[PDB]
RNA sequence: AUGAGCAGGUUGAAGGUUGAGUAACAUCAACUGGAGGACCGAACCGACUCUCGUUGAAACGAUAGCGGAUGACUUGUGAUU
RNA sequence: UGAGUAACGCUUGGGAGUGAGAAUCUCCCAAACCGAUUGACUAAGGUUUCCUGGACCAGGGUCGUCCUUCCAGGGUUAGUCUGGACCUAAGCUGAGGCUGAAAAGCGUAGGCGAUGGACAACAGGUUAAUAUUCCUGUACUUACAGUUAGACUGAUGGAGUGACAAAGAAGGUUUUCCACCCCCAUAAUUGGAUUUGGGGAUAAAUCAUAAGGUGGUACAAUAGGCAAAUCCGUUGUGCAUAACAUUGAGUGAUGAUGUCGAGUGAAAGUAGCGAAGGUGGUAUUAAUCAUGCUUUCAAGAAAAGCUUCUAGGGUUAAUCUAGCUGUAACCAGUACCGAGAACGAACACACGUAGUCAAGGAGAGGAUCCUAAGGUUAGCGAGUGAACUAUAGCCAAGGAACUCUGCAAAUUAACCCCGUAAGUUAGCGAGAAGGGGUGCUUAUGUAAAAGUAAGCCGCAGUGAAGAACGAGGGGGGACUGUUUAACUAAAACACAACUCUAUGCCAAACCGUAAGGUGAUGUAUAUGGGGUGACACCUGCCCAGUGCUGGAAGGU
């Protein structure tokens, strides 16, 4: 009785963090498409 | 002290009611940007005297306007209360 | 020395035994030194990447790798007494408590009749040949027992230094070197003349008749309960596969790989090591 | 059914009565529903005719159909009962009470009947 | 890798100590002993039949019980595959 | 449309008041409830849902004058506590460097990363919110610069320590509990009354005592710990009575001229007021001693950090101790909900999830009933007692005849007293099987009491609650065990073990292409791969073909 998602902000910092975040080219092209398509929201910090 | 910090001094219900006590604990409203001891002699430098204890906390950024087309967030800034010696009361 | 185990339960019963641990052991309770034990870490059966490469690993306590001068030439020339014989978890034999000399202490691999203040020497020369001491390979008589021996030129015995284990001596060669020595498992090889080495039979005699009794003390041991290879699907194993009990209907079957493992000696020839070889346990050559 | 509310139970009703009846005794009148004043009347005329002897033996059976409430206390209730209120009723031969129907609680439409007591 | 916890009633093994006893044994007797992929039995882990129900409270629950309940222990925090 | 339709998402009634308008708003009285929770602390999380006043557009299973709903205002205080300025474990990043079409990966020096080590403040107080955080009392701690008083300190390197498993038992300590006593309210009117019920606390911190507990202690040097050593260590001499080093509950004084304390008490049960504020114990309990000791093997973290030796240096002193004085102690954090009317929940979905406190009586228990403090009416109600559904109470007799079916469903379990067969691989079987009785009063009881005798009641005394239905035989599996999310829980898997093969170090094999690594921080008594899978006896035949290996002559 508990579902698959479990909030928890810390391991969300480690997770989804920019500064964790530029582990990869990936990422920075992902974002940069993002950015293309005018997402506004593009990290946790700004929700 | 970049005389730049201490924006104001806040009036509100508790602060009335702290301040018709003996507590001498003026609120300012300031930005976070200093720390304790920062704000403390900044205090001090802008006022001359020395103050006798700060409590520092900050005003959580909650959603403004509630719920609408157009909601909000409510802006952060640090509130300082500090003790005086009961023999001196400041001039605002 | 192995002793049967009273199974006690109401489930069945035991088929274990268990080593003596009062009569060859003292200081059951561990209560070991600081210095030279270091964590010896387990991998669970993983690489250095955390990718698959090793089957049924894990389930073992935490155990400490003791730095044991492996070598044997660290410090030569003095004399130094047996202090105790301590078990060692992380190795077939069981290690051994030594002090030295000049201040400092050692711990070595025993062998078999050794005891509690007991003189041993370690040297670059020729000593007393009874086992236990350490010394090279250019003052032996032939048709004697020793074990650890290494083949680079101070580099560390690490051959037949498991409970049991011995090497023979079977002469020379006309080169100055390349002594031909009878290895463990019926192997023969010849190594160098000049490479240190552990006279007589290794301790612990017990391992060729342990029962482990149960499948709970293979996992505290670390081999975990595997699936037998018959057992999975035809496309994960080339055993598994088919249904209602089936053997294997195939000759000489591979590995889960595409490698077949029976009748096929698993080794490169082209070395000039392969060429260094006596005996491959069947004959010469 | 599964797991739900208790409902109508022979227990829920007695203790109900009880307590209307309680309820009247100490205020007089009491505002309930018809198809509880039906039964309550009933009650209510038992009680009254079983201890209008007025012993201790009469007080030994009814302090096990009195409540308590908010104004008064059941050692009060009882001892104004026995001393001028019991004994009241002992002129004319039943119909001590009066269930007069109002009109309709607004939650449900459900009836309201207000209860009046004289000889 | 680092840890939390597994109530209570328990049962009372070998080892050992001693004595009789034997030439040595052996055998027996009294005792400490708290072990048992040991018991009942919880919190707990998960569900073996039927039942309610299957536009249900339910994209799998609940109950009548159920197997385990000191060990192939349940599980956490962070990471890995 | 079906349709005014199934349900109305696990639970009351009354009085009075507000409001024009009341089951639904408020204050209170009961009831039955959670009560190893319907209680509290509470990691973590959502983040204003937290509080006051006004109101109910939208959401609330009718309604909602209300809601935790919206509007306006208000709300979170830290030298001592939690996460930083100290540190690291798995693990992660990673100067360079290596590998690698680029890309990228590896990984060195390094640097991050608590669920941890060291580590300085407690109680009381009021509020509409919190307050190891605001106030009072009581304290303590760190560097800082001067200071006098004492002294040569000793690190960057080394060493000791830090630094550690699990399980079991009994000892010391306050405790819990019991009776007594003191204090507090307290004489009942419905038969007898010649009363019942409650309470009896004080700490941080300082000083002394420290019950007790652990492990050599004093002397001389050495060839080891890049250098060196007085430090560690090695060997010697003295004593092994414990000298010795060492910690330590709790105890006594402050602390404490105080708070507090049931209760008493002005329109609030509030200011104010406030009595006592102890004795002996334990054959029951928890924790300090306790990184204690012993036992078993599965052999049981590092770094930071304290002591610390030489190094290094110091000298009209480096360094450092004590005392005094002054300065100051920065960062995020503090609301409630918080195994949930605030998390997951698609929801105000009858559900479940970190750790801690954890009542009493009956019982060993925290198994089960009841209630304690606290908290509660699970945001549709009112009816009547048709069929049928869901659950139960009752059923006699036949008593498994039903049906493939003892699927489903009823005695049975607690207490003690007896007693228990075959088989056995001597573990078990066995709580076998199969039975006796269990209440109260009087006396006696022992350390409490079991227990015994006398008497009595009922139809019968785990009186309501909670407690197993067996024997005989077979097939497989030995067994304790893993199971296909959620159609199916095992004779399948696993399994100890047996068996064969391969692997001698740059080991075989494995990951990629590769450095490199697992293998393995292994060393043939080890590992891998193939077959079977308690125990015992064995596993007979043919290498026909095929396969695998060896091979030397020789045709390709």
């Given at each position: 009785?508990?579902?698959?998602?479990?909030?928890?902000?810390?391991?969300?910092?480690?997770?989804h963090?920019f500064?964790?975040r530029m582990?990869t080219a990936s990422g920075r092209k992902v974002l940069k498409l993002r950015r293309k398509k005018?997402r506004?929201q593009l990290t946790?910090?700004?929700? | 002290?970049?005389?730049?910090?201490?924006?104001?001094?806040?009036?509100?219900?508790?602060?009335?009611?702290?301040?018709?006590?003996?507590?001498?604990?003026?609120?300012?409203?300031?930005?976070?940007?200093?720390?304790?001891?920062?704000?403390?002699?900044?205090?001090?430098?802008?006022?001359?005297?020395?103050?006798?204890?700060?409590?520092?906390?900050?005003?959580?950024?909650?959603?403004?306007?509630?719920?609408?087309?157009?909601?909000?967030?409510?802006?952060?800034?640090?509130?300082?209360?500090?003790?005086?010696?009961?023999?001196?009361?400041?001039?605002? | 020395?192995?002793?049967?185990?009273?199974?006690?339960?109401?489930?069945?019963?035991?088929?274990?035994?268990?080593?003596?641990?009062?009569?060859?052991?003292?200081?059951?309770?561990?209560?070991?030194?600081?210095?030279?034990?270091?964590?010896?870490?387990?991998?669970?059966?993983?690489?250095?990447?955390?990718?698959?490469?090793?089957?049924?690993?894990?389930?073992?306590?935490?155990?400490?790798?003791?730095?044991?001068?492996?070598?044997?030439?660290?410090?030569?020339?003095?004399?130094?007494?047996?202090?105790?014989?301590?078990?060692?978890?992380?190795?077939?034999?069981?290690?051994?408590?030594?002090?030295?000399?000049?201040?400092?202490?050692?711990?070595?691999?025993?062998?078999?009749?050794?005891?509690?203040?007991?003189?041993?020497?370690?040297?670059?020369?020729?000593?007393?040949?009874?086992?236990?001491?350490?010394?090279?390979?250019?003052?032996?008589?032939?048709?004697?027992?020793?074990?650890?021996?290494?083949?680079?030129?101070?580099?560390?015995?690490?051959?037949?230094?498991?409970?049991?284990?011995?090497?023979?001596?079977?002469?020379?060669?006309?080169?100055?070197?390349?002594?031909?020595?009878?290895?463990?498992?019926?192997?023969?090889?010849?190594?160098?003349?000049?490479?240190?080495?552990?006279?007589?039979?290794?301790?612990?005699?017990?391992?060729?008749?342990?029962?482990?009794?149960?499948?709970?003390?293979?996992?505290?041991?670390?081999?975990?309960?595997?699936?037998?290879?018959?057992?999975?699907?035809?496309?994960?194993?080339?055993?598994?596969?088919?249904?209602?009990?089936?053997?294997?209907?195939?000759?000489?079957?591979?590995?889960?790989?595409?490698?077949?493992?029976?009748?096929?000696?698993?080794?490169?020839?082209?070395?000039?090591?392969?060429?260094?070889?006596?005996?491959?346990?069947?004959?010469?050559? | 059914?599964?797991?739900?509310?208790?409902?109508?139970?022979?227990?829920?009703?007695?203790?109900?009565?009880?307590?209307?009846?309680?309820?009247?005794?100490?205020?007089?009148?009491?505002?309930?529903?018809?198809?509880?004043?039906?039964?309550?009347?009933?009650?209510?005329?038992?009680?009254?005719?079983?201890?209008?002897?007025?012993?201790?033996?009469?007080?030994?059976?009814?302090?096990?159909?009195?409540?308590?409430?908010?104004?008064?206390?059941?050692?009060?209730?009882?001892?104004?009962?026995?001393?001028?209120?019991?004994?009241?009723?002992?002129?004319?031969?039943?119909?001590?009470?009066?269930?007069?129907?109002?009109?309709?609680?607004?939650?449900?439409?459900?009836?309201?009947?207000?209860?009046?007591?004289?000889?």
């Open positions: 009785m508990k579902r698959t998602y479990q909030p928890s902000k810390l391991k969300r910092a480690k997770t963090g500064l964790a582990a005018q506004a946790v910090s700004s929700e | 002290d970049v005389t730049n910090v201490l924006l104001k001094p806040v009036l509100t219900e508790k602060v009335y009611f702290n301040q018709m006590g003996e507590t001498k604990k003026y609120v300012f409203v300031v930005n976070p940007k200093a720390s304790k001891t920062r704000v403390k002699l900044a205090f001090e430098l802008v006022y001359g005297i020395k103050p006798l204890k700060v409590n520092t906390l900050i005003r959580k950024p909650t959603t403004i306007r509630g719920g609408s087309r157009f909601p909000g967030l409510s802006k952060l800034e640090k509130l300082a209360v500090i003790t005086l010696p009961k023999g001196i009361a400041i001039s605002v | 020395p192995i002793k049967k185990i009273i199974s006690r339960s109401n489930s069945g019963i035991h088929h274990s035994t268990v080593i003596d641990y009062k009569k060859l052991l003292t200081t059951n309770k561990n209560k070991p030194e600081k210095s030279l034990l270091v964590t010896l870490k387990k991998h669970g059966g993983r690489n250095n990447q955390g990718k698959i490469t090793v089957r049924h690993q894990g389930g073992r306590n935490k155990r400490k790798y003791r730095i044991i001068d492996f070598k044997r030439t660290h410090y030569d020339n003095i004399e130094a007494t047996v202090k105790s014989i301590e078990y060692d978890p992380n190795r077939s034999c069981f290690v051994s408590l030594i002090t030295y000399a000049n201040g400092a202490k050692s711990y070595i691999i025993s062998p078999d009749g050794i005891k509690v203040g007991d003189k041993i020497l370690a040297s670059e020369h020729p000593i007393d040949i009874k086992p236990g001491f350490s010394m090279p390979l250019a003052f032996i008589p032939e048709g004697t027992q020793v074990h650890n021996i290494e083949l680079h030129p101070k580099g560390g015995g690490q051959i037949a230094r498991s409970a049991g284990s011995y090497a023979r001596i079977l002469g020379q060669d006309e080169t100055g070197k390349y002594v031909i020595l009878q290895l463990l498992s019926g192997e023969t090889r010849k190594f160098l003349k000049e490479c240190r080495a552990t006279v007589g039979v290794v301790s612990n005699l017990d391992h060729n008749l342990v029962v482990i009794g149960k499948a709970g003390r293979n996992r505290h041991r670390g081999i975990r309960p595997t699936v037998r290879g018959s057992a999975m699907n035809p496309n994960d194993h080339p055993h598994g596969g088919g249904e209602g009990r089936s053997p294997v209907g195939r000759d000489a079957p591979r590995t889960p790989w595409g490698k077949r493992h029976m009748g096929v000696k698993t080794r490169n020839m082209k070395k000039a090591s392969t060429n260094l070889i006596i005996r491959n346990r069947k004959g010469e050559q | 059914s599964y797991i739900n509310k208790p409902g109508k139970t022979s227990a829920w009703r007695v203790m109900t009565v009880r307590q209307q009846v309680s309820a009247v005794l100490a205020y007089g009148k009491i505002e309930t529903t018809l198809k509880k004043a039906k039964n309550t009347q009933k009650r209510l005329d038992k009680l009254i005719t079983l201890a209008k002897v007025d012993n201790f033996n009469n007080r030994r059976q009814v302090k096990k159909w009195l409540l308590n409430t908010n104004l008064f206390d059941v050692d009060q209730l009882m001892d104004h009962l026995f001393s001028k209120v019991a004994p009241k009723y002992e002129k004319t031969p039943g119909g001590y009470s009066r269930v007069l129907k109002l009109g309709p609680r607004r939650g449900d439409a459900t009836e309201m009947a207000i209860l009046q007591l004289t000889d």
